[PDB]
Paper text:
Burkholderia pseudomallei lethal factor 1 (BLF1) exhibits site-specific glutamine deamidase activity against the eukaryotic RNA helicase, eIF4A, thereby blocking mammalian protein synthesis. B. pseudomallei Burkholderia Lethal Factor 1 (BLF1) is a member of the CNF1-like deamidase toxin family which acts by targeting the site-specific deamidation of Gln339 of the eukaryotic initiation factor 4 A (eIF4A). eIF4A is a member of the DEAD-box superfamily and is an essential component in the translation initiation complex, supplying RNA helicase activity responsible for melting the secondary structures present in mRNA prior to translation. A mechanistic similarity between catalysis by the cysteine proteases and the glutamine deamidase activity of BLF1 and CNF1 has previously been suggested given the similar orientation of a Cys-His dyad in their respective active sites. Six of the conserved residues between these two toxins lie in their respective active sites, including a conserved L-S-G-C motif located on a short loop containing the putative cysteine nucleophile (BLF1: Cys94; CNF1: Cys866).
We determined the structures of two crystal forms (A and B) of the catalytically inactive BLF1 C94S mutant in complex with human eIF4A∆20, at 2.5 and 3.0 Å, respectively. These structures are closely related with BLF1 C94S binding between and forming interactions with, each of the N- and C-terminal RecA-like domains of eIF4A. Comparison of forms A and B further reveals a shift in the position of the target Gln339 in eIF4A with respect to the Cys/Ser-His pair in the BLF1 active site. Whilst in form A the orientation of Gln339 is consistent with the suggested involvement of these residues in the mechanism and the expected nucleophilic attack on the side-chain amide of Gln339 by Cys94, in form B it is not. We suggest that the orientation of Gln339 in form B represents a non-productive mode of binding and the following description will therefore focus on the interaction between BLF1 C94S and eIF4A seen in form A. A total surface area of 1900 Å2 is buried in the formation of the complex by the interaction of two patches of residues on the surface of BLF1 with opposing faces of the N- and C-terminal domains of eIF4A across a wide groove between the two domains of the helicase (14 and 28 residues of BLF1 with 14 and 20 residues on the domains of eIF4A, burying 700 and 1200 Å2 surface area, respectively). We note the involvement of numerous negatively charged residues in BLF1 (Glu22, Glu70, Asp108, Glu124, Glu127, and Asp128), as a dominant feature of its interaction with positively charged side chains of eIF4A (Arg110, Arg161, Arg316, Arg362, and Arg365).
Residue numbers in the entry:
A (entry chain A): 3 to 211
B (entry chain B): 20 to 135, 144 to 147, 151 to 330, 336 to 406
């Protein structure tokens, strides 16, 4: 019945339920944020407005920011069943470390560049060269490799992708399942409309440098 | 580069006339230390007096002596507890602070540990927010005698997702805790931290241009006459490989005109303008992000990547020029912009590089092998 339960349900069952976000959210730093969920079309809008049949919620939010990387810290991932959202992916990428941070990287930010900015993070400094981490990585299909291919830095399965020919949008979300533990989900929006939610999987990746 | 704006006038340019203690100065002169920046020159004094301070200092201030001095001058050297707490966004920045603080600190007998185990109560603790919150949480550190809370590079920390940890740490500190926030950037949420945590603080800000043209290749085409623009626009789709484009138009009337002619040439298009509410824009942005439309045509935008931006009409002023093609942030400094120029534009603006205050070069023939 509650909009929060329905999203959680749609993600687990692999059903179609679209999410709309107020640009105002991107003014809120990565972290635990109180929002209001409102019915909009057959989906759900997320904003900071209490009216229009707005149901409060406490979610893990991760904004988008032009010319930058935004990061969600693992220490924020703790309340079981809490939802997690990041702003619309319309070229940008999302990199997630299992037991680690979630990074929303602006689209034109080069892979070499964001890798260097990511490595500054505590969790990355502990990821010893020659060992593995579980990583969930998502980029737009057909996008230039300069913006996402990390093959010089990691050995492991290829990243997941969204769209085709560098066209399309994605919405990434999650459900916290434990301490520094989260199940990730995605759905795409292309000229064919919106797909259902599907798991965003973590693969094993070895750090090469 | 920029200009200082303060609500407080109390400048000092020397270590000599800061009213410091003797052991501190022994440390200062011992290690030839640098002069403080203009920002620092006006923060240091109220800061020593224990007031709340917001200082828009450049990144890396943590390496400097003035930074260290602002912390060491306040420490009761005979109380064997943690009196100052510095939060930095990364290990290297915390270590740099620890290094200069402990260098000066040694002459004074002050202690400084960087949280990045068993040994842990130094006067000053510097470290990463999560790590530091954890230590307070597991009680390896005490907020009991902490009277100063420094947030070095608050912007970087909020960007790196430590807002939560920062708010949780604050809740554990005494009501009378001096807060000193340093941030090169002052976006909305950083301002919120200060509103939430500070009482009538000293403000030393720097008005800084948020959108920039840096790294955006800017071209112009002498279209000469208005009526040759449509053809010029169609030829660009045969010269270049364009995935998605944004075309800026000056009037609602022309927006509608161009989307009709464009649609007649089998372009998928989304038209947007000022006489539309937010719910109607949302559906239109939804269709562009999804790629259902390959062309967005608007007047004076929420999308992360496009092949280029076309100024079909030249914007009425520089502000508009920057809102149209300028980008925020330090990275992903790339972009392509094409301006269409008529004789009337040239006769009105005289010289577009000067009018829009940027470098715009005539679009060459080999343009595809350049962007």
């Amino acid at each position: 019945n509650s909009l929060e339960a329905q999203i959680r349900q749609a993600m687990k069952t692999g059903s179609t339920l679209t999410i709309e976000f107020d640009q105002a959210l991107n003014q809120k730093s990565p972290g635990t944020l109180n929002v209001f969920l409102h019915p909009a079309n057959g989906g759900v809008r997320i904003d900071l407005d209490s009216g229009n049949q707005g149901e409060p919620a406490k979610i893990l939010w991760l904004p988008w920011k032009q010319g930058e990387l935004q990061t969600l810290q693992p220490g924020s991932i703790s309340t079981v069943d809490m939802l997690f959202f990041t702003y619309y992916l319309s070229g940008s990428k999302v990199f997630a470390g299992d037991g680690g941070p979630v990074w929303h990287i602006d689209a034109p930010v080069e892979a070499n560049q964001f890798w260097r900015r990511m490595s500054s993070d505590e969790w990355m400094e502990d990821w010893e060269v020659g060992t593995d981490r579980q990583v969930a990585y998502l980029h737009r299909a057909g996008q230039s490799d300069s913006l996402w291919n990390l093959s010089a830095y990691l050995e492991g399965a290829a990243p997941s992708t969204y769209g085709r020919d560098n066209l399309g949008q994605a919405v990434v979300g999650g459900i916290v399942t434990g301490r520094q533990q989260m199940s990730l989900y995605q759905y795409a929006t292309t000229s064919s409309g919106s797909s259902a939610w599907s798991p965003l999987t973590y693969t094993l990746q070895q750090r090469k440098q | 580069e920029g200009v200082i704006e303060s609500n407080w006038n109390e400048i000092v340019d020397s270590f000599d006339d800061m009213n410091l203690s003797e052991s501190l100065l022994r440390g200062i002169y011992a290690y030839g230390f640098e002069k403080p920046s203009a920002i620092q020159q006006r923060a240091i004094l109220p800061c020593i007096k224990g007031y709340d301070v917001i200082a828009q200092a450049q990144s890396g201030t943590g390496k400097t002596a003035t930074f260290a001095i602002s912390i060491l001058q306040q420490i009761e050297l005979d109380l064997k507890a943690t009196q100052a707490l510095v939060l930095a966004p990364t290990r290297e920045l915390a270590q740099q602070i620890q290094k200069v603080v402990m260098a000066l600190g040694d002459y004074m007998g002050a202690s400084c540990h960087a949280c990045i185990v068993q040994k842990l109560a130094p006067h000053i603790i510097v470290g990463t927010p999560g790590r530091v919150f954890d230590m307070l949480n597991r009680r390896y550190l005490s907020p009991k005698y902490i009277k100063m809370f420094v947030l070095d590079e608050a912007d970087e920390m909020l960007s790196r997702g430590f807002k939560d940890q920062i708010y949780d740490i604050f809740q554990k500190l005494n009501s009378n805790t001096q807060v000193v926030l340093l941030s090169a950037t002052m976006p909305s949420d950083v301002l919120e931290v200060t509103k939430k945590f500070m009482r009538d603080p000293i403000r030393i800000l720097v008005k800084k241009e948020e959108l920039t043209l840096e790294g955006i290749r800017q071209f112009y085409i002498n279209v000469e006459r208005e009526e040759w623009k449509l053809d010029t626009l169609c030829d660009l789709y045969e010269t270049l490989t364009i995935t998605q484009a944004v075309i800026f138009i000056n009037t609602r009337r022309k927006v509608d005109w161009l989307t009709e002619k464009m649609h007649a040439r089998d372009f998928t298009v989304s038209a947007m303008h000022g006489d539309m509410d937010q719910k109607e824009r949302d559906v239109i942005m939804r269709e562009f992000r999804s790629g259902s439309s390959r062309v967005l045509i608007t007047t004076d935008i929420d999308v992360q990547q496009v092949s280029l931006v076309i100024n079909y009409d030249l914007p009425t002023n520089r502000e508009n020029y920057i809102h149209r093609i300028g980008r925020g942030g330090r990275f992903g400094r790339k972009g392509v912009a094409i301006n269409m120029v008529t004789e009337e534009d040239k006769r009105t603006l005289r010289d577009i590089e000067t009018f829009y205050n940027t470098s715009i070069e005539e679009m060459p023939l080999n343009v595809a092998d350049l962007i």
